[PDB]
Symmetry: D2
Subunit: 512 residues, 4 copies
Amino acid sequence: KKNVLLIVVDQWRADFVPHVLRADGKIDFLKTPNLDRLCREGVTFRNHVTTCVPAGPARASLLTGLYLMNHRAVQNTVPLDQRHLNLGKALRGVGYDPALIGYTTTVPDPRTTSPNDPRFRVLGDLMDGFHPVGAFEPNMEGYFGWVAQNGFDLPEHRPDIWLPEGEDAVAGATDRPSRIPKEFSDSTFFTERALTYLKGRDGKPFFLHLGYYRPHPPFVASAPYHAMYRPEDMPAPIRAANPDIEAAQHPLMKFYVDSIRRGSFFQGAEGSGATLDEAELRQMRATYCGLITEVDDCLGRVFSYLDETGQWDDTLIIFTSDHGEQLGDHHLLGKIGYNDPSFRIPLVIKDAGENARAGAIESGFTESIDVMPTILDWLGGKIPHACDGLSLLPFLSEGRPQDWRTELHYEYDFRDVYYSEPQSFLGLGMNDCSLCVIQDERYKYVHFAALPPLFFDLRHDPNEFTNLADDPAYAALVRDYAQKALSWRLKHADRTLTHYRSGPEGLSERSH
Amino acid sequence: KKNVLLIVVDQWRADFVPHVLRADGKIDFLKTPNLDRLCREGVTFRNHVTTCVPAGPARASLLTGLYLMNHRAVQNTVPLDQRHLNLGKALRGVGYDPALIGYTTTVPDPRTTSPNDPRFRVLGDLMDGFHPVGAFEPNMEGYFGWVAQNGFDLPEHRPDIWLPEGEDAVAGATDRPSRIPKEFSDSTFFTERALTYLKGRDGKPFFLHLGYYRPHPPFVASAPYHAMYRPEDMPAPIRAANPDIEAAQHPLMKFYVDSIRRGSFFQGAEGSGATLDEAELRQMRATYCGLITEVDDCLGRVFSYLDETGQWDDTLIIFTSDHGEQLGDHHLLGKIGYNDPSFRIPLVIKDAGENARAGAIESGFTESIDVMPTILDWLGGKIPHACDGLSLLPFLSEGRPQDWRTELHYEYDFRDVYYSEPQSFLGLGMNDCSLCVIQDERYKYVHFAALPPLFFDLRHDPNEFTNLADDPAYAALVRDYAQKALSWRLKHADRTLTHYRSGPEGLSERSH
Amino acid sequence: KKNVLLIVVDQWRADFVPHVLRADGKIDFLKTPNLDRLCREGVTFRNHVTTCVPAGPARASLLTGLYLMNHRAVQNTVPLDQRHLNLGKALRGVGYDPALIGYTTTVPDPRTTSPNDPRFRVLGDLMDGFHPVGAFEPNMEGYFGWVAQNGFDLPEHRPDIWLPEGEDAVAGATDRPSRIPKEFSDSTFFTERALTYLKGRDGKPFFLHLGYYRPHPPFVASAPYHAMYRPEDMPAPIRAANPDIEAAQHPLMKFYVDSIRRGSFFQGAEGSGATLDEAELRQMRATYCGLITEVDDCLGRVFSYLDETGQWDDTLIIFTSDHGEQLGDHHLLGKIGYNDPSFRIPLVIKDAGENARAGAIESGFTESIDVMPTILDWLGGKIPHACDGLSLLPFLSEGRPQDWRTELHYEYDFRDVYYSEPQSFLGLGMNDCSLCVIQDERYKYVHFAALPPLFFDLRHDPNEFTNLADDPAYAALVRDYAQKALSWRLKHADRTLTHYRSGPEGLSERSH
Amino acid sequence: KKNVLLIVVDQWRADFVPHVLRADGKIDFLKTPNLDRLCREGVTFRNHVTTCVPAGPARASLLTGLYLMNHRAVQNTVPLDQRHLNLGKALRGVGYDPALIGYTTTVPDPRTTSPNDPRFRVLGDLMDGFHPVGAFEPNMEGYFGWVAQNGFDLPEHRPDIWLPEGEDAVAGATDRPSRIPKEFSDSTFFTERALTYLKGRDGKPFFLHLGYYRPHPPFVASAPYHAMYRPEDMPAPIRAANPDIEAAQHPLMKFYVDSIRRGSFFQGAEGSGATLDEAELRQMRATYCGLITEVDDCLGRVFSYLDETGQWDDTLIIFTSDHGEQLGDHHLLGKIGYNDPSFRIPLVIKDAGENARAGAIESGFTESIDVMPTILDWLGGKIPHACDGLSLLPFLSEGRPQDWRTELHYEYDFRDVYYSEPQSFLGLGMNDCSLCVIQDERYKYVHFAALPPLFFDLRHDPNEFTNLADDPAYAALVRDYAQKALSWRLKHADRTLTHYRSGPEGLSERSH
């Protein structure tokens, strides 16, 4: 029997993974024993990125194996064209039910449904082709209904469960717990749906997309996770001397430093994200770690059910996140722009049985578009022609293929959406608001469609403070990275029908 | 605010509706106080039929507003063509989320999915376009997973929860309870999903398809519903002197009398349905009533939540069943053939506010294809051109329209499916295995595509024992009913594009 | 090598086929030596009907193998749903180019094109899936452009080429030629396109739909075909004592007797069709024969090219018409209503090589829906599941199959179109304006959806003057024919997906 | 009234346009009086390119307004995805019939038709959505059938009409005429179809795509066009000292210098294209001019019909070519690679009425993707969101828009097709065989996906002999052009749905 458990957390940074911290001799300032078990038993990928942000685009790439340049779900609220083959439909093609807990943040294709469809009122709904067994639902109604049915009285504005405890509490980074008990938290909800689904399967082969919302904000935690980590034990945020000096690097950086609000990160909070002080940012980081450890506790319950039913060694387990989180770096909160912390994400894979590379940490450059090909390959399917990504299965046996990619790539599109509208400030039209990034161990190149490019020397400037793109001494290097990025564009043009050929013998297909 | 609650039970007969029994001066031998409330407050339709059986075809007609002659989902296991507009997609067209609890028994269109799709392994899965919030799931996994997560230990073969209590129990009609407590029954499950969904909506407008499996078999009930009704208080089954005399009426009757097995109606039971004695049939009927009263108790919890939140007077409530049940009549169990008890079904409608016809019983002839037009009309939508049915809203105000139909119509297709294969016995090919029925207060005509027809005088022979179709004295009457049925066929040919016209002014549409 | 030549004339009656006239000892009052060659070498089907009229519906049935009840292109100007598989697409499935000369009169599906498409300004355009090599074109522009490019000066209103020669001519039935020379006639045009296409093929396998407009009206002929037949040698029209007595038979008969205009049949003519006298009708018939003989002369040129290139014995030749013509019978002109002369059509089939039944006349009942299955069968294709018709190939070898149909069937829908609007006169809505016909050697039954039925004893009343449907002495016979027609409806419900099945082994198909 | 005549020749170079030659003080060594009339009356665009080559890709860009990066019909024999909106369907959206003479070289989408479709046996067939009124047809059957029907006896192998006259003739560049008289030439054929179509329209508004095959090879002409130009009066080919020195520039150049055969350019010829001597190339150029003048003579007949019917001043006339021709430059024949002569093409536009810029020559950079937007704009349509091109109408009134593009762009994909397979020689996989080009008045940058780039200084090296891309002194310039090309990629990602947005008010669209 073969099972696949795809765990997708939200907003969890790659540098909040204890197995990698310890390997580098750093203090592992947070506890994730269940993730650590996956790392001891499988392969941890230390240079994994999402190919775009925020949730809607990231999940389009994860669930189609396509770059943003091909899926075109370029921002939250922008439709996903129905033509793209997604993981749910591909799973049905190999005889698996594509069971899903959590959310996909997918706007339907308007050519397929009425313009009055309620799914157009929200950031996104479930992607067509999945079988929902534990949906957060539009406006988190699935979760709130479950809390209410469990007998907990909700406030009139339901997200006020995430105000800090106590009528005198000041909204923002907090040392207080939220107003929801642990047993009715959202992580508990998704976990109960996972256990219900696995118990219903009763040993039969499964695919399950187990989505967790946490550690997505609001950065407030149920007791006692709110108090589990001391602010002084957290890694310091990395940022310029002040927000103006930070913003001077690039107009897009200035837009986000100026515009991001605390209320998007802490329920009811007022003021700008960029003005948080070091103590507030350390408290935010401690609460973020508490939310992470709650998820890890919950995963322990899922893993316990797999152990008790004898299914652990039959299950391919993939742990990843949709995207990262700035967490105060560069004066930013959220998943925006071009910096490493928004795009670097965990990826740990435990094969069935005793893993040949158990415990290894892989530096090969991997991208979220590789996850769908990996799952389909493992289940014996053909990888769709159109996918941009490649199967990671060679990394679980002999290691990095000799012809594997030598750069990481990602994209970001910042055209206007209802809650964030940079076009007027930037002076740009909607089809000119994008960037792409190419990077390796030494250099990082950020190319904007219609704004200045950026170039960083990562050995000397690992935190991306010193743009070199306009320095004439770097002209040959900038040329080289722009050339690699341009080749990458040409190599990833759409592949839907390009293997077919007419000819004297009729219709044929080219394989190489 | 406008809400719609569409309650769809399964396998509940029209003559098991106490409000109608009492109106006719009959003993109301079962208790349904919550349904009785709907009847006191709304309109009870006493001549409602499903336009086909069993579940898959019945639910295709209910959820598309089309006769079987147009939807072509002619038996369980036969695909529903994606071209037909269903109620879920139509609801999205009026801005409603098409939330659904229970099941639709819909086989996907093979042109839309892989032939390996797991949805082709089961009798049917969820119809495309609905939003599931409480699915029974393939093989009832949703229910069983919920029972297991509630801490109840299930037997190795999970349907053995429906064996009668006690290792010494004989499977079949029983005076013992099932092996599942009331608090973990399937009716409790669907009810908890309904409460969870309504609590999540928190007062916002809703559509909810609230499906119950009961009183579908196995005919066994959780305590104390198994003992709630005395067998001697049940209405007697109506059947011929013996199964051979019954079967002589028609080859299709013979096929079902010979083939139907007790194990399809009582978990683990052996033997033929037709050999049940009168006492066994009375016990079966008493258990069936117990399952009905459990559903009614559950509806009381849903109605209580609507009352407490002040939504009752804002909600159009429609109560109906997918189809009926022979329940021993004519030596048959199940929903098959051509007799009234398989096709007659409850229908009660309570409008928002104080209903103009509260308490009335309507004799106008209504069909399940009318339900979707009624809901869309009530929500301010246009009724799709293709629907065969008509809105029932006039019946809630002034009464039966002057041009309403004057006959009831239904269809049955009995081509081979994996668990019932009459073609060899009947000597028929797959496209020749159907019948249609037309009837009014006086006469009933059953026309087979490729077997003898039947004709009944319902005043003198209300129970359909005496075929008159081959009696020369009835030639003019049989002619007349065949002519009405043939006109009905011509009038209901597909209407997808037939209102459009080319012409000198370009494309236009005819409205009359 | 295998070729198919499908010759489709327009408006040519089955009783204008000399081989059948001579077989019955009647005078063959018109000459068709080239058709007579096909009859001597192949099989002539004497009981062939189109399953509906006029051109648009007839050609939908011919080119899909479907009854009107399934294709739903129910009148000229009504769209053909793109879902139906047509002969052109099916030919591509067997590797044949679906070359077409003439027209198909097909209104596009509005869901597939802009509402501004010029194809919605005309009665119909080319059916999707064919390869046009000689289109009449919208408004006959293809023909008129060819005449103009040939150097012939056209009048300002181009159809005035069909006024009778001479400024003093009275428009109507005429003993004068038209104003177009034979070398620039429409039959010459289609023939030149056929020769161009066959010469381009240069011996390679072909399918060609060779459409002729003639003998469709206006009933005027190029010299000397206008004078080739004497009016006194024509068969007399068959009609009641006067138009009022004719019209009394049925409201639909009255509508057409009252409404049909001479201008629809003779260019520029005034007055009603029903008031033509016997001499005028005989002249009309003589001109109609002249147009037929012109087509036959043209076919001789096509056949000569096949003989000279050695392809005759490699070619399946099918000669047929889209529909018939009343030609004055029952006071009617055109192709309307329910009488035999509108629906009976020629069908002659010459197989490749020496035909086993060369010269035979077949009385088995054949329908235009059989033609597409016949062609696909002959080319080695599978007949589409959805077709209503059956292959005629058994008739070319051993003869009529033992299980062949025992009645002929056809349909007519008379809902309002821009140039003929009977609904107000009849008092009917658009979905109630149809009839179906079932008949055999003895009896004919015409069933209207919402008007009185008709029944004829064809031995005693071969010309359909005496309705018997309301005579009580015929009640059992009328019953029997209504029952056969109702069975036919049930047997021909749509078959798109009804062979598929879900089940424990996955998706399967039933073959019987 | 508004008409559009879109004249599309094949393989005609931009530097074979006399109006531009004379403007630059060069000898106009060929005569095109009818094209010269369009130039005197309209605007001549001197920096127009096709965005890709050869015919199939070029015509996909012309007829969709999309770059190859979006249409993906990347080589002849590769399907065009049906999702792209083409000019024919867009014309129907504005009420115009999309009449077409010539060919489009379009391989159908395999998801829309049988794999056995004969359209998969040829390089391409007609694009879906056009109305053919003069097709060359598969294998030029339309033309050959027309020649045969005109009474001209064709040789057994029909293309042998293009052998030079006389049994002793040596195949290759020739001073002899072909074996087809002028009155039966292919240019005469397309012209007769144009006149037939316009005469059929009889003054009604038209769109006509008037395609000519010439001056596509074989480079042989009907008498007396074969002798109209002296070889010594032709411009000399521009090429390196020998083929080896030429080929050293780049592996793709070497592939084509080594592989191109004379038989692809002269009927029956043997040997390599690269070994033609200067005299042979001058004769080839003189014959090429003869074919051009034959097309111009033919256009004079079309223009004469427009003048005589008073339609000239009501007609937007656009003259262009699908692509250019190397004509011996760089040792190459055909339309391949990256050099200017393969991609630069004529474009002349005459507006209705007296043109504001009559006679002007425009240096603004225009691309073939601009043609479809121009036509739709002129007819009052909306330009489809997805188009990459922009309307040229501002150039006919006030001139180049201030925000017009500042570089020309084109693409070439050289993955294996049945008659040319460079992948093995180049060592590349199928998705790595492309290049893109960006250029302006000063510099040209050729970027290969997986081979070395090229960079040319066009003032000092107008003929592209001296690659500078690997010269360190050019690093900043190469950087700049790679950056412009990378921005162009980002700006032209697919736009199908990217203007739509979900949000609190429902579905909306962004316009800027």
